[PDB]
RNA sequence: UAGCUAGUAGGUGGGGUAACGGCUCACCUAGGCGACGAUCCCUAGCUGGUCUGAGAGGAUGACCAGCCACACUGGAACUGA
RNA sequence: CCCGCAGAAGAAGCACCGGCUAACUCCGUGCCAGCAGCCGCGGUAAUACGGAGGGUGCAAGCGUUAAUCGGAAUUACUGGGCGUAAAGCGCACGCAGGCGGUUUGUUAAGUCAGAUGUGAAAUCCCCGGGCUCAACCUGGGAACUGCAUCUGAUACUGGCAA
């Protein structure tokens, strides 16, 4: 099942979800099929708080990928902000 | 359009196979003289039309036997 | 026995320099005088002649400026044994461009500057300086 | 050398040969005293300098200097073993570490101590 | 005016009847700092003797080196019997970039930023000598030009 | 990770002033500045190239107050930026906030200013700064903050600001002790003795 | 370490596999690899990379990531995509 | 993270000082004890051993050992040699291999140019952004010098023909 989640790479305390798809098998900082936007959750408020490349998450889904609750979450708030 | 290799018989000995060898140049890795190598490749031969030293052309194909993986497509030029 | 002809006229240039010679003279061929063209042309020598139809003997005039060679130092760099070969963005620069290379390219013998401002690469003929 | 001569035979680095084959590659080495004994330097020099045969715990068993002035070792003595070789005494090429294990510090040394050991006085 | 610096100083010793007379040699460099650099090498008994000859020599016997804005013009290889030097132009703030023997000729004769290095004999005597004649062959490109009967953009541009 | 020893001694070494004392005081009244320190400070060294090239990097480190490790991190930046690698070192050097807090007088001396810096006195941009290395950038403002303002130190200290030379690329207002950041100074606005192209030799030796 | 290899090399046909295939058989042909180093021995997980080096290179493969192999030692199948 | 209280108050060690290599004297010792990376020290004023004073270098670290690269142009392709310093086989023929006079044509193999695909992400580098700075995290790019395919150029090398 392709999906499309948030592999955490950051820092201790200070946490950098990087949106990737990829098999759901394969573990979550590891193999990704494609990279699809960033998100931080700690914002200067000034800076990109999430990037997404709408239109390749749109494709991918369109393929069959499943999307995590978050991701879902942050897609819908993008466009909700547009 | 079809990828493509040329070579020539060096045995024929096989029952419907041949043996080619493809030379070629390679720019040497560390000194740079310019060295020739060269690829034997056991090929699929129906006919055994191919005689030993000809010019052949190869194309390569699905597994034939334990080590055939090349057909000939046409000979070039034969008993020279 | 003769393998490097190229070599041959870049050493009789040489030789006859130290030698304090006017004008040598060898063997003429087609690339011998497409060489001799480019270093007249970038005016490391005086001239250069062709005398003959069946055996051609080319005839280079040398040329000194304060009783000194005009040409410092001539060594071939793709010899025979090792060619060497080069992109355009990789054509060496001899004494930070006061000398010259040859480039031998698809469209003809010419300077390395020629050959970057023309797009091309080739085989380094030799090094002039 | 010909080009084609090279890529007929490379080239082929002589591998170094290393001076303290019985530690294998490693910083320090434990072993047992087998024998404590004296022995005289080379012409030029001339004392009576204090060594000690070490049996090491990978088998080896090697002459090892005892630097400093005064030692108490004996037969049994474990004692660490480290690198560095010593001049005008031939065979010997392994220092005992003062302060490790069995083997004590210098008495009232009071510079370089921590080459020897040696606490740092409390004044 | 000219700043002046001693690169070595020797020792030597020559075997006579009554046995082993010492004497010195004293090897300096003169320079203008703008381009002009003469090296001495002087003997006497003692060594500010050894060294004020050396100075005498260094003043004459000196040479014109077309510098470029602190810099060489081109890289020069250089050749006196087992001393091979090499020499670059360098980018600024590069400084000074040698051996002392060929670090003192520099810095007296003035290149600001250079890349050098010495191979084979390190000998100062002969590394002196070869890095001043690898700078004395080192040509210009007004003098190029006017060697092959052209203008300076016509080789440069 | 400071040195905290006697600061003449450092002076009378390097053999000039190092301006490690307010300089209220003409330091020849306070030290013999011409004699190295030591029992055998007055007999000369007859001092190799390495010596000198150790002496000048000494020098500049003593005169910014930064040790070895932090300096070798500076040279490596200073030449991985483009330009003048000797040049961006000494810009490097000058844009630490102790230094443009000593410069727009603040601090009687570096040490004073970093002492400033640290008890959270100063501030960038309205933003309290308790990092000594802190990079100021041009078109910055530096101010005291109001609830040390009220120190006698500074107010002291800014007598002797006006009694140096007042730096170019600083515009100081001292009624409200604040100040911004112009530029980054060249290497000409700074003292002309400081030999740098042998900092640049002896981190290349 | 100069020679190695009889399912070895190729072919017809049958069998087997998700699939091509000596994968396995029955028979026929007597071949195949090798000085551009086969075979044999010793050593070793490979790569993106890390250290060093002006660079080419030398060494190296810990942590992160991709791949492979193993799960007390040896062997075997079953369930199951 | 911010605010308030107290009080300089709770907080500096390690190696070295003969030359290489920055930093020197006195006392003790007397080829003993001892030091040492190499050269080397020590037999009666030792800047080299041990102690003190002074100084130099690093710094919450400092030294010692082990291992790799460098310096080492000391496996030299970039970048070495062979008359005497180590190094031309005793000599000749000769197969495989390496290289090959000059002109014309053709080929596009090598070669060059362009384009496409690919060269995972992270790491290195450039311009920026966020943790009070930095380490650290991070955006975009360059790069990944390669490999393969296609269309071109034909001087040089190769093939073929004369
Ligand atoms: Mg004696
Ligand atoms: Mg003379
Ligand atoms: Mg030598
Ligand atoms: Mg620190
Ligand atoms: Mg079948
Ligand atoms: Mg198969
Ligand atoms: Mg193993
Ligand atoms: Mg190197
Ligand atoms: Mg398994
Ligand atoms: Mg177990
Ligand atoms: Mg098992
Ligand atoms: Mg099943
Ligand atoms: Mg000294
Ligand atoms: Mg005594
Ligand atoms: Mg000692
Ligand atoms: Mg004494
Ligand atoms: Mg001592
Ligand atoms: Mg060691
Ligand atoms: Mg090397
Ligand atoms: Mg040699
Ligand atoms: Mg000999
Ligand atoms: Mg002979
Ligand atoms: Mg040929
Ligand atoms: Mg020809
Ligand atoms: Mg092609
Ligand atoms: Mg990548
Ligand atoms: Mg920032
Ligand atoms: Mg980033
Ligand atoms: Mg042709």
Same mark, same amino acid.
Request: glycine content about 8%.
């Given at each position: ?82 | ?80 | ?129 | ?52 045969? @070490?049996? /090491?715990?990978? $088998?080896?068993? =090697?002459?090892?200097?005892? *630097?400093?002035?005064? +030692? ?5 003595? @474990?004692? /660490?073993?480290? $690198?560095?070789? =010593?001049?005008?005494?031939? *065979?010997?090429?392994? +220092? ?28 | ?157 | ?205």
């Amino acid at each position: 099942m392709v999906t499309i989640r948030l592999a955490r790479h950051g820092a201790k305390k200070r946490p950098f979800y990087q949106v990737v798809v990829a098999d759901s098998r394969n573990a979550r900082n590891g193999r990704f099929i494609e990279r699809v936007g960033f998100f931080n959750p700690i914002a200067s408020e000034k800076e990109e708080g999430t990037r997404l490349d709408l239109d390749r998450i749109a494709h991918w889904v369109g393929q069959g990928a499943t999307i995590s609750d978050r991701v879902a979450a942050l897609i819908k708030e993008v466009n909700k902000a547009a | 359009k079809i990828r493509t290799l040329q070579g020539r018989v060096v045995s024929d000995k096989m029952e419907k196979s041949i043996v080619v060898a493809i030379e070629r140049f390679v720019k040497h890795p560390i000194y740079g003289k310019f060295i020739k190598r060269t690829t034997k490749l056991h090929v699929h031969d129906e006919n055994n039309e191919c005689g030993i030293g000809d010019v052949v052309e190869i194309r390569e194909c699905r597994p034939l036997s334990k080590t055939k993986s090349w057909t000939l497509v046409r000979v070039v030029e034969k008993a020279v | 026995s003769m393998q490097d002809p190229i070599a041959d006229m870049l050493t009789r240039i040489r030789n006859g320099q130290a030698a304090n010679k006017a004008a040598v003279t060898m063997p003429s061929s087609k690339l011998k005088v497409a060489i001799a063209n480019v270093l007249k042309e970038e005016g490391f020598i005086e001239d250069f002649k062709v005398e003959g139809d069946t055996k051609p003997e080319l005839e280079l005039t040398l040329k000194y400026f304060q009783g000194k060679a005009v040409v410092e130092s001539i060594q071939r760099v793709s010899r025979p044994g090792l060619r060497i070969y080069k992109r355009k963005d990789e054509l060496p620069k001899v004494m930070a461009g006061l000398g010259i290379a040859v480039v031998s390219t698809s469209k003809g013998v010419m300077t390395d500057r020629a050959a970057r401002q023309a797009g091309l690469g080739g085989e380094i003929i030799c090094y002039v300086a | 050398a010909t080009v084609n001569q090279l890529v007929r035979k490379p080239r082929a680095r002589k591998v170094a040969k290393s001076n303290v084959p019985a530690l294998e590659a490693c910083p320090q080495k434990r072993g047992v005293c087998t024998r404590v004994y004296t022995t005289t330097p080379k012409k030029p020099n001339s004392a009576l300098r204090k060594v000690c045969r @070490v049996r /090491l715990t990978n $088998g080896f068993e =090697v002459t090892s200097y005892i *630097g400093g002035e005064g +030692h108490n070792l004996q037969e049994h003595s @474990v004692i /660490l073993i480290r $690198g560095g070789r =010593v001049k005008d005494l031939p *065979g010997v090429r392994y +220092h005992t570490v003062r302060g490790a294990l069995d083997c004590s510090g210098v008495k009232d040394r009071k510079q370089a101590r921590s080459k020897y050991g040696v606490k740092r006085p409390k004044a | 005016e000219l700043q002046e610096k001693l690169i070595a100083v020797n020792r030597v010793s020559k075997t006579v009847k009554g046995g082993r007379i010492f004497s010195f040699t004293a090897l300096t460099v003169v320079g203008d700092g703008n381009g002009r650099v003469g090296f001495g090498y002087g003997k006497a008994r003692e060594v500010p003797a050894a060294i004020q000859k050396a100075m005498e020599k260094a003043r004459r016997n000196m040479i014109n080196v077309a510098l470029n804005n602190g810099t060489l013009q081109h890289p020069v290889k250089g050749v006196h019997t087992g001393s091979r030097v090499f020499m670059q132009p360098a980018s600024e703030g590069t400084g000074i970039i040698a051996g002392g023997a060929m670090r003192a000729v520099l810095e007296v004769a003035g290149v600001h930023n250079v890349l050098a290095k010495a191979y084979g004999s390190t000998n100062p005597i002969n590394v002196v000598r070869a890095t001043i004649d690898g700078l004395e062959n080192m040509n210009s490109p007004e003098m190029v030009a006017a060697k092959r009967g052209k203008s300076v953009e016509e080789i440069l541009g | 990770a400071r040195y905290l020893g006697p600061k003449l001694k450092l002076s009378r070494r390097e053999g000039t002033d190092l301006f490690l004392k307010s300089d209220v005081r003409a330091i020849d009244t306070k030290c013999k500045i011409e004699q190295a320190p030591g029992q055998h400070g007055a007999r000369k060294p007859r001092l190799s190239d390495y010596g000198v090239q150790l002496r000048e990097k000494q020098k500049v480190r003593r005169i910014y107050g930064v040790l070895e490790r932090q300096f070798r991190n500076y040279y490596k930046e200073a030449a991985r930026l483009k330009g003048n690698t000797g040049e961006n070192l000494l810009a490097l050097l000058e844009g630490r906030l102790d230094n443009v807090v000593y410069r727009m007088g603040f601090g009687a001396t570096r040490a004073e200013a970093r002492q400033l810096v640290s008890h959270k006195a100063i501030m960038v941009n309205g933003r309290v700064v308790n990092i000594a290395s802190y990079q100021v950038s041009p078109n910055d403002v530096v101010s005291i903050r109001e609830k040390a303002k009220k120190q006698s130190r500074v107010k002291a200290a800014l007598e002797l600001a006006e009694q140096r030379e007042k730096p170019t690329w600083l515009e100081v207002d001292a009624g409200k002790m604040e100040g911004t950041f112009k530029r980054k100074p060249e290497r000409s606005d700074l003292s002309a003795d400081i030999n740098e192209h042998l900092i640049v030799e002896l981190y290349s030796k």
